[PDB]
Amino acid sequence: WKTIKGKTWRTKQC
Amino acid sequence: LGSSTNPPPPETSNPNKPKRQTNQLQYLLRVVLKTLWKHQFAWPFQQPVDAVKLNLPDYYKIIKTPMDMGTIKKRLENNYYWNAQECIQDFNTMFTNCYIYNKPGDDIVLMAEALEKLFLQKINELPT
Amino acid sequence: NQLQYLLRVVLKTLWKHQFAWPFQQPVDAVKLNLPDYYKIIKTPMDMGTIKKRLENNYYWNAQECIQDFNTMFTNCYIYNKPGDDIVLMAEALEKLFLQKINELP
């Protein structure tokens, strides 16, 4: 999971 | 509810865009892209990101200008670019997309960084 | 005329960019857990503030507005190290910015 400036999404790692 | 889908792939030709085949663009296809395509880490980048198979509903919610080596490969074979800078920008878009969407240290980022360092080695010998 | 173009075309184009969301409002360093941000960034700037300034007759000329845009980009490049994800997003936004202002009337 990655978070950039109050926005989160699932990465390819998860 | 339903199955999330992949968007259409980027274009590989355009009748309105001027075509050209310079010696640098030849070098980009037969040397630069050839080296990256055969690298062990190339398989996640040879085709557009398959967000459906990867269970990534957010990928094309974040990335709106995707790019892959398979799109780059077809663009070079079709003389899609006018110069090498346009093709190099497609490479950087592919790398930057991976770096923005995934975290540093992720496997996909480690693989992209390896391909990029090789990419930079080959374009440093871009011919006249 | 040029201030109209920055508010109607340049900002509108950048605001709809895929990587625009971190730059559409002032950096809330407390909500974002960036405690050193305003120790390092002396002049924060964002496209939301530039929008308010373009709408409320704040700028002397178009060059002052362009300075605020460059300040927003420079802040990101100062706080985050090169190659960071947010830096790459700022560079994509900046490249589109330079293209849209190169055709200023």
Residue numbers in the entry:
A (entry chain E): 1 to 14
B (entry chain A): 39 to 166
C (entry chain C): 61 to 165
Task: Provide passages from the article that reported this PDB entry.
Despite heavy academic and industry investment in this area, the generation of paralog-selective inhibitors has proved elusive because of the extremely high sequence similarity between the bromodomains of family members (90 to 95% within the acetyllysine-binding pocket residues). Crystal structures of 13 distinct peptide–bromodomain complexes revealed highly diverse structures and binding modes among the cyclic peptide ligands.
The peptide forms an ordered β-hairpin with a high degree of internal backbone hydrogen bonding. It also contains two additional AcK residues and the structure reveals that, remarkably, these two residues engage a second molecule of BRD4-BD1 (BRD4-BD1-B); AcK5 binds in the AcK-binding pocket and AcK7 contacts the surface of the additional BD. Consequently, the AcK hydrogen bond to Asn140 that is characteristic of these complexes cannot form in the same way and is instead mediated by a solvent water molecule. Some contacts are also made between the surfaces of the two BDs. Somewhat surprisingly, we established that this complex displays the same 2:1 stoichiometry in solution, rather than a 1:1 complex (that would have allowed the AcK12 residue to bind in the pocket of each BD).
